Amino acid sequence: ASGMIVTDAGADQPIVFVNRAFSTITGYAPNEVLGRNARFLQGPQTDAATVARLREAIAAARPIQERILNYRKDGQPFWNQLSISPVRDETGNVVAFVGVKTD
Amino acid sequence: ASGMIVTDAGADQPIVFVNRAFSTITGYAPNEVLGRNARFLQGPQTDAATVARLREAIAAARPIQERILNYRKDGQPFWNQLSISPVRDETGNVVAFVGVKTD
Ligand SMILES: Cc1cc2nc3c(=O)[nH]c(=O)nc-3n(C[C@H](O)[C@H](O)[C@H](O)COP(=O)(O)O)c2cc1C
Ligand SMILES: Cc1cc2nc3c(=O)[nH]c(=O)nc-3n(C[C@H](O)[C@H](O)[C@H](O)COP(=O)(O)O)c2cc1C
């Protein structure tokens, strides 16, 4: 199974759902992450240019894939092959964002 | 806000998340629907041919949009402009399905 994060569309994209795989991968339980922006997964060695590309894509509701250095709850660095896409209604309104970690 | 349902990919797509708009629209709380296939929203005058097109598209992990008759918890019918899409990882594995109601 691949990790999955779902966020609200607006106002800095707080997490509303993580799948079981997310907790296996990151060591974080759902209650520890709901209502937070996913940027808490980043750490000292995270590439700022990669973070900026995610920021611009999410702001514009553009799909993006990045290999980004993330950090488990226990602090272990892991490479996150991250893909983010908007969820739209048929009018084109953004309803949510979905992020997947590909192992 | 538009209604959104997220399901597992496999084994008859049990619901794993519904947004707040889902509960406003349908009258169901998350604890009433999590772990169930979304077909409980259908009822006696739901169009069988429409349900068959949804079944075939989801089985194939193909996006689909239909206008389908659904029923609130209290039994009141509502027209659901429903769009369902797979969520894939970068290997092409289906991680989840997402369903949206367009007002
Ligand atoms: C649905 C979704 C999932 C995300 N998943 C991750 C993730 O797994 N790891 C990560 O470092 N950032 C993730 N992000 C990105 C951060 O939330 C944030 O958008 C990014 O750090 C850029 O914004 P900032 O410069 O304001 O931090 C995700 C964003 C969204 C919308
Ligand atoms: C993510 C997702 C959301 C769904 N949302 C709805 C819905 O809002 N209303 C509905 O009638 N069916 C919905 N369905 C469809 C049913 O779950 C089911 O796939 C459909 O009734 C066809 O299969 P069946 O013939 O086995 O019932 C959804 C399915 C998925 C995967």
Numbering used by the authors:
A (entry chain B), B (entry chain A): 48 to 150
Published text:
Flavin-binding fluorescent proteins (FbFPs), engineered from prokaryotic and eukaryotic light, oxygen, voltage (LOV) photoreceptors, are promising fluorescent reporter proteins. Their small size (about 10 kDa for monomeric FbFPs such as the improved LOV (iLOV) protein derived from Arabidopsis thaliana phototropin photoreceptors) and their oxygen-independent fluorescence make them ideal reporters to monitor transport and anaerobic biological processes. In contrast to GFP-like fluorescent reporter proteins, whose absorption and fluorescence maxima can be tuned by exchanging certain chromophore-constituting amino acids, the absorption and fluorescence of FbFPs and other flavoproteins depends on noncovalently bound flavins, whose structure cannot be influenced by mutation. Using spectroscopy, X-ray crystallography, and quantum mechanics molecular mechanics calculations, we provide a firm structural and functional understanding of spectral tuning in FbFPs.
To verify the transferability of the blue-shifting Q489K mutation, identified for the plant FbFP iLOV, we introduced the corresponding Q148K mutation into the recently presented thermostable CagFbFP protein from thermophilic phototrophic bacterium Chloroflexus aggregans. Much like iLOV–Q489K, CagFbFP–Q148K possesses a blue-shifted S0→S1 absorption band with a maximum at around 444 nm (≈3 nm blue-shifted relative to parental CagFbFP) and a blue-shifted fluorescence-emission maximum (≈6 nm blue shift relative to parental CagFbFP; compare the gray dashed line and solid blue line). To verify that the structural changes, which we observed for iLOV–Q489K, are indeed a consequence of the introduced Q489K mutation and are not due to the observed succinimide modification, we obtained the structure of the corresponding CagFbFP–Q148K variant. Altogether, we were able to obtain three types of CagFbFP–Q148K crystals, all using the precipitant solutions with pH of 6.5 (data and refinement statistics are summarized in Table S1). In all of the obtained models, the C terminus of the protein is clearly unlatched, and the side chain of the introduced lysine is facing away from FMN as was found in iLOV–Q489K. The photophysical properties of the CagFbFP variants are relatively straightforward to interpret.
